[PDB]
Structure 1
Amino acid sequence: AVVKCKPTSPGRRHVVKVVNPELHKGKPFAPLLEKNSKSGGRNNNGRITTRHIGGGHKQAYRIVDFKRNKDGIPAVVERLEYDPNRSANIALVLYKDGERRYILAPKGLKAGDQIQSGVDAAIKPGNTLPMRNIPVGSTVHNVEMKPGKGGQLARSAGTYVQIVARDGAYVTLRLRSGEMRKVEADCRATLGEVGNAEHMLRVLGKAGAARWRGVRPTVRGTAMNPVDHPHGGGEGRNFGKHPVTPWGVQTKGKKTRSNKRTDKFIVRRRS
């Protein structure tokens, strides 16, 4: 649930917490863990390539299963877990053959729930089956775009996709963006919505909270000198130019999709 914190200090006043009691209070499943060091938004050349990244808390990498290939074995949900690496919540599941995996926790999922992947699998939340097997009009998440690759669409805290149509070898998806997209009908998808839907209701409430999430502060181009940004300079507050990136490209409207290879799959762009 969301929780407005009492204003016992400025910087706590405007805070809203998103508290799920059902998460695991404990150390995660260590076998599925692995190291994940921070970039600072800097590439192999050592240059900053994406500004405003830096610092934040040390995080491990949970090995989430997005490919979801344990066909026919039924699994049961052991617990839900906090993943620092994503807006969603993860679920530690236990297959009957003794293997455990992390999966995106869907909306209704909880400890004790049974889930299943496969063509034969049942059409219920958390189950995963090819979209030619999934009825039209259903909500799914963790959608593969290429068969066998692993889910790439609809992984964020409260996303999902609509299968609006199945026309032969393809099905047409309604993406969260509003973009309509063809996808091969043999690609895989998980039933239901992804879990942590009130994720958006949280409000950080202070500068430090943003820092905790590895976000360095943002300087406005207009606050700079001309040598730095197109917006710089001006005695007092001047802005007599069309908005642009630090690299001179228009920002308020100018489209930038250039991919002519996948134009065919886009049924309708978002609006």
Structure 2
Amino acid sequence: GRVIRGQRKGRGSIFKSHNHHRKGAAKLRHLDYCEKKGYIKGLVKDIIHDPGRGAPLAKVIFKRTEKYGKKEELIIASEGMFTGQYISCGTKAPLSVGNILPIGKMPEGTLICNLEHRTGNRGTLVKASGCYATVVGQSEDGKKTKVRLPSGAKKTIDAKARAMVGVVGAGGRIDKPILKAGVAHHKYRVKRNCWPKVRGVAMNPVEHPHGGGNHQHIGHPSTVSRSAPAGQKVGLIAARRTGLLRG
């Protein structure tokens, strides 16, 4: 047989990310003395667009505290921020949209985004456009905070980790029909080489488990086990259930 299409992606030759015009990685600010004792405030200079990403980025300027000079950050922007705005980051910053606070000082019900799942991590969890989380519970002895992730899962975090108040901007962009093949050609042109897609039952047996036959059918159960080797896991992977959902 021949190596399957999904196996070739791990070599990373024509399947690497398309990133010529991207603007940089979005991080929080590095944890230091100011955000551990008081707070520090930086000024929003511009909201810009990142070619591969749905959400927009804010360009925000802080003033160096250990030397004379200015410093730059790129941060996922929450819906409501404007150019000319001052935001404040630290353990003692007030509760307002756009500030960055430790999650252990937020009351129950607050909507947060751009969260650290470990302290000092510089933000990993809630980042896609239109997404938010919810603070659901606080530990009685401190030290622990409970949140509800966009997928619906519940997760307990260290209570010193940081997050931004508000929701990710540019929300609602999965409600417009794409409606044309060329529109999707332009969409993935700036992401990676994953489109269009030929389906397995239309191939020959050498190159897919679904190939061959005189009638274009699968011929074997399409739910495969978690333990199958690389060239064989191709249908529905370790599915607990199939068919239309009814609840």
* Fold-level similarity (TM above 0.5): yes
Counterparts of 2:210 and 2:195 in 1: how far apart (Å)?
A: 21
Residues in 2 aligned to 1:77 and 1:90: alpha-carbon distance in whole angstroms: 11
1:64 is paired with a residue whose SS is coil
Q: Structure 1's 55 and 219: CA in aligned 2 closer, same or farther, altered over 3 A?
A: farther
Deviation at 1:244?
5.3
1:199 counterpart SS class: coil
* Structure 1 residue corresponding to 2:89, chosen from 99, 108, 117: 117
Go from structure 1 to structure 2 and tell me whether the alpha carbon gap of 1:196 and 1:150 turns closer, same or farther (over 3 Å shift).
same
Change (3 A) 1:250 1:227: closer
2:167 counterpart of 1:193: yes
Q: CA deviation at 1:157?
A: 1.1
- What is the letter of the counterpart of residue 209 of structure 1? H
Could you tell me which runs of 5 or more consecutive residues in structure 2 were left unpaired when the two chains were aligned: 1-5, 65-69, 225-229, 241-246
Aligned pairs for 1:89-128 within 5 A: 89-97=56-64, 98-128=70-100
What amino acid maps onto 1:128 in structure 2? Answer: I
Higher Cα Rg, which structure = 2
| Alignment partners' CA distance in 1, 2:11 and 2:167 | 31
How far apart, CA to CA, are the structure 2 residues paired with 1:176 and 1:227?
41
1:84 is matched with 51
C-alpha RMSD of matched pairs (Å): 3.1
Match of 2:10 among 39, 44, 49: 49
Tell me if structure 1 keeps the 8 A contact 2:59–2:74: yes
Find the counterpart in structure 2 of residue 231 from structure 1.
Answer: 210
Residue type of the alignment partner of 1:120:
K
Partner secondary structure for residue 149 of structure 1: coil
**Which residue pairs with 1:10 in the alignment?**
none
Q: Could you say which structure has the higher helix fraction?
A: 2
Other-structure match for 1:130: 102
Contact 2:28 2:73 (C-alpha < 8 Å) held by counterparts? no
Q: Does 1:166 align with 2:138?
A: yes
| Contact 1:230–1:244, Cα closer than 8 Å, also in 2 | no
Q: Distance in 1 between matches of 2:237 and 2:127?
A: 27
Cα distance per residue 1:197-225 (max 9 Å; x no partner): 13334554324324423333222111112
Shift in CA distance, 170/158, structure 1 to aligned 2, threshold 3 Å:
same
Q: Kindly provide the amino acid, as one letter, of the partner of residue 181 in structure 2.
A: K
Asked if the contact 1:141–1:192 (Cα under 8 Å) also holds between the matched residues in 2, the reply is: yes
Length-normalised TM-score, structure 1? 0.69
User: 1:158 aligns to what SS in structure 2?
Assistant: coil
Does the 8 Å CA contact 1:242/1:250 hold for their aligned counterparts? no
1:1-271 pair list within 5 angstroms:
48-49=9-10, 53=15, 58-67=20-29, 69=31, 71=35, 72-97=39-64, 98-167=70-139, 168-204=142-178, 205-207=180-182, 208-213=185-190, 214=192, 215-243=194-222, 247-249=231-233, 251-252=235-236, 254=238
Structure 2 Cα separation of the partners of residues 50 and 186 of structure 1: 39
Aligned AA for 2:238?
A: K
Alignment coverage as a number of residue pairs:
214
Report which stretch shifted further, 230-239 or 63-72: 63-72
Distance 2:17 2:116 in 1: 32
The alignment's TM-score, normalised by the length of structure 2, stands at: 0.75
State whether residues 68 and 117 of structure 1, in contact with CA within 8 Å, keep that contact through their aligned partners in structure 2: no
- Contact kept in structure 1, 2:147 and 2:156, CA below 8 Å: yes
**Separation in structure 2 between the aligned mates of residue 187 and residue 57 of structure 1, nearest angstrom:** 30
AA at the equivalent of 2:45: E
Which range is displaced more, 211-220 or 247-256?
Answer: 247-256
Q: State the identity as a percent.
A: 27
Contact 1:67 1:151 in 2 (8 A): no
